[PDB]
Amino acid sequence: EPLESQYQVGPLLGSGGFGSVYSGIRVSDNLPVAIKHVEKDRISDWGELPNGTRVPMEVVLLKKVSSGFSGVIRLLDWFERPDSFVLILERPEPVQDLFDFITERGALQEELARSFFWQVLEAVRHCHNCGVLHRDIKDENILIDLNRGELKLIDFGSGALLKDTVYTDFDGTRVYSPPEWIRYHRYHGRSAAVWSLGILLYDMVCGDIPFEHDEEIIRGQVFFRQRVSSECQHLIRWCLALRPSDRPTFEEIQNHPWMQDVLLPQETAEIHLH
Numbered sequence: 608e609p610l611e612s613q614y615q616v617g618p619l620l621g622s623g624g625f626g627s628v629y630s631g632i633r634v635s636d637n638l639p640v641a642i643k644h645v646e647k648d649r650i651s652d653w654g655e656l657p658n659g660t661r662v663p664m665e666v667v668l669l670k671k672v673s674s675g676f677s678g679v680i681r682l683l684d685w686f687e688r689p690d691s692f693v694l695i696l697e698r699p700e701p702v703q704d705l706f707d708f709i710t711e712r713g714a715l716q717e718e719l720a721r722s723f724f725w726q727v728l729e730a731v732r733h734c735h736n737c738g739v740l741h742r743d744i745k746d747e748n749i750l751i752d753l754n755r756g757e758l759k760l761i762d763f764g765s766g767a768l769l770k771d772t773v774y775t776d777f778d779g780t781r782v783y784s785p786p787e788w789i790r791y792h793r794y795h796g797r798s799a800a801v802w803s804l805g806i807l808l809y810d811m812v813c814g815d816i817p818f819e820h821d822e823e824i825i826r827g828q829v830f831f832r833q834r835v836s837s838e839c840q841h842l843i844r845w846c847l848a849l850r851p852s853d854r855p856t857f858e859e860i861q862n863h864p865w866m867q868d869v870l871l872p873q874e875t876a877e878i879h880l881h
């Protein structure tokens with residue numbers, strides 16, 4: 608029944624705005640888990656469960672996306688403590704986040720970037736079908752299951768319920784945020800997500816993000832720092848179109864010529880991660 612008896616705490620995986628995440632083991636079956644602690648005072652968005660209880664929005668969002676597709680890190684359990692909330696999440700073993708993977712390897716081969724990008728599109732697409740907008744799609748929030756060659760989305764703490772009306776709040780990564788956000792502090796769910804996907808694709812094929820400052824984002828001129836194919840450049844520039852309405856839909860991204868003949872996750876691992 609308690610968490611200190613049910614779980615076995617290991618080293619700290621990371622800490623920030625999310626805020627403290629530890630590696631752990633579910634003592635019952637020795638299942639590798641992640642144990643996330645967050646203070647109640649350090650919580651911005653709150654939501655209600657179907658049974659009507661005050662929980663952080665992140666618990667609401669994770670519950671909606673946590674059955675049972677391997678594209679998102681599933682919420683296995685959660686506890687409420689007097690001054691904090693404790694989240695028990697899946698933890699792949701062996702694992703490496705996409706950020707550390709690009710740092711170590713540099714710009715990824717187009718074949719590996721295709722497999723990876725398709726998997727995030729399938730994951731993001733799963734989230735929207737569940738009525739969840741991630742709002743912080745970036746290299747740091749993508750984990751690679753090194754044995755299966757499968758990508759997993761983490762951190763729904765900047766997220767929101769997906770809607771068709773304007774969003775006036777944002778607390779994700781600035782350098783991944785669209786020009787509408789920077790200029791007008793207003794954006795729409797799917798087109799903002801497609802902009803961040805273009806930022807991510809550039810990062811995979813070039814080994815770094817295309818823009819650092821507000822004026823670069825606002826200008827939207829894409830300079831390619833590495834050799835990238837005409838088709839991949841076309842997809843990137845389309846995702847990063849200044850006018851949200853000019854951006855591709857998820858269907859348009861997945862039907863793009865560059866996006867064809869994607870490797871399966873297991874062959875991705877056997878060719879690129881072995």
Ligand SMILES: CC(=O)Nc1nc(C(=O)Nc2ccccc2N2CCCCC2)cs1
Pocket residue numbers: 620621622625628640641643680696697698699702703704747748750761762763764
């Ligand atoms: C290396 C490794 O096994 N990392 C893992 N991170 C998670 C996770 O859910 N992450 C998480 C869940 C909710 C908010 C933020 C995060 N973090 C964890 C620290 C790194 C940044 C994202 C599960 S396993």
